A paper describes a structure:
Rrm4 is the key RNA-binding protein of the transport process that recognises defined sets of cargo mRNAs via its three N-terminal RRMs. Rrm4 and bound cargo mRNAs are linked to endosomes by Upa1, containing a FYVE zinc finger for interaction with PI3P lipids (phosphatidylinositol 3-phosphate). Here, we demonstrate that a flexible MademoiseLLE (MLLE) domain platform within RNA-binding protein Rrm4 of Ustilago maydis is crucial for endosomal attachment. Our structure/function analysis uncovered three MLLE domains at the C-terminus of Rrm4 with a functionally defined hierarchy.
To verify the structural models further, we expressed and purified an N-terminally truncated version of the Rrm4 carrying the three MLLE domains in Escherichia coli (version H-Rrm4-NT4 carrying an N-terminal hexa-histidine-tag). A complete dataset was collected from a single crystal diffracting to 2.6 Å resolution and a P43212 symmetry. Surprisingly, the unit cell dimensions were small and, with a Matthews coefficient assuming 50% solvent content, only 128 amino acids would fit into the asymmetric unit of the crystal. The structural data indicated that the protein was truncated from both termini during crystallisation, resulting in a shortened version of the H-Rrm4-NT4 protein that formed stable crystals. Both MLLE2Rrm4 copies adopted the same overall fold as seen by the RMSD of 0.29 Å over 59 C-alpha atoms. The MLLE2Rrm4 domain consisted of four helices (designated α2–5) arranged as a right-handed superhelix similar to MLLEUBR5. In comparison to the MLLE domain of PABPC1, the first short helix was absent in both MLLE2Rrm4 and MLLEUBR5 structures. When comparing the obtained crystal structure with the MLLE2 Rrm4 model generated by TopModel, the average RMSD was 0.69 Å over the backbone atoms, close to the uncertainty of the atomic coordinates of the experimental structure. The accessory MLLE2 domain shows variations in the critical region of the predicted PAM2 binding pocket, suggesting a novel mode of interaction with currently unknown interaction partners. Our detailed in vivo analysis revealed that MLLE2 carries out an accessory function for the correct attachment of Rrm4 during endosomal shuttling.
Numbering used by the authors: 95 to 160
The structure:
Protein backbone atom coordinates (compact mmCIF):
# COMPACT_ATOMS: atom_id res chain seq x y z
CA UNK A 1 0.00 0.00 0.00
CA UNK A 2 3.11 2.16 -0.60
CA UNK A 3 6.66 0.82 -0.46
CA UNK A 4 8.66 0.96 2.78
CA UNK A 5 11.94 2.81 2.78
CA UNK A 6 13.71 -0.55 2.71
CA UNK A 7 11.53 -1.81 -0.14
CA UNK A 8 12.01 1.42 -2.08
CA UNK A 9 15.77 1.09 -2.03
CA UNK A 10 15.53 -2.51 -3.26
CA UNK A 11 13.64 -1.09 -6.26
CA UNK A 12 16.31 1.56 -6.73
CA UNK A 13 19.14 -0.95 -7.13
CA UNK A 14 16.94 -3.20 -9.28
CA UNK A 15 16.17 -0.23 -11.55
CA UNK A 16 19.87 0.77 -11.77
CA UNK A 17 20.91 -2.69 -13.01
CA UNK A 18 18.44 -2.73 -15.95
CA UNK A 19 19.20 0.91 -16.88
CA UNK A 20 22.23 2.63 -18.33
CA UNK A 21 24.02 5.52 -16.68
CA UNK A 22 22.35 8.90 -16.95
CA UNK A 23 18.90 7.31 -16.82
CA UNK A 24 16.49 8.99 -14.33
CA UNK A 25 16.60 6.07 -11.92
CA UNK A 26 15.22 8.01 -8.94
CA UNK A 27 12.11 9.06 -10.88
CA UNK A 28 11.64 5.62 -12.48
CA UNK A 29 11.83 4.12 -8.98
CA UNK A 30 9.27 6.61 -7.59
CA UNK A 31 6.87 5.52 -10.33
CA UNK A 32 7.35 1.79 -9.77
CA UNK A 33 7.31 2.14 -5.98
CA UNK A 34 3.82 3.63 -6.36
CA UNK A 35 2.45 0.40 -7.84
CA UNK A 36 0.36 -2.09 -5.83
CA UNK A 37 2.33 -4.46 -3.62
CA UNK A 38 1.86 -7.55 -5.82
CA UNK A 39 3.45 -5.66 -8.73
CA UNK A 40 6.36 -4.31 -6.69
CA UNK A 41 7.23 -7.84 -5.53
CA UNK A 42 6.90 -9.01 -9.13
CA UNK A 43 9.37 -6.30 -10.23
CA UNK A 44 11.98 -7.47 -7.72
CA UNK A 45 11.49 -11.15 -8.66
CA UNK A 46 11.07 -11.15 -12.45
CA UNK A 47 13.92 -9.23 -14.17
CA UNK A 48 11.94 -9.23 -17.41
CA UNK A 49 8.82 -7.74 -15.81
CA UNK A 50 11.04 -5.10 -14.17
CA UNK A 51 12.49 -4.27 -17.60
CA UNK A 52 8.97 -3.86 -19.00
CA UNK A 53 7.91 -1.34 -16.34
CA UNK A 54 11.24 0.47 -16.28
CA UNK A 55 11.00 0.95 -20.02
CA UNK A 56 7.36 2.04 -20.08
CA UNK A 57 8.06 4.44 -17.21
CA UNK A 58 11.13 5.93 -18.96
CA UNK A 59 8.87 6.47 -21.98
CA UNK A 60 6.13 8.26 -20.07
CA UNK A 61 8.99 10.36 -18.64
CA UNK A 62 9.98 11.18 -22.21
CA UNK A 63 6.44 12.03 -23.38
CA UNK A 64 6.07 14.32 -20.37
CA UNK A 65 9.41 16.09 -20.96
CA UNK A 66 8.29 18.34 -23.81
Amino acid sequence: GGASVKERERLLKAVISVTESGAPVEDITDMIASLPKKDRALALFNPEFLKQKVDEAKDILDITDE
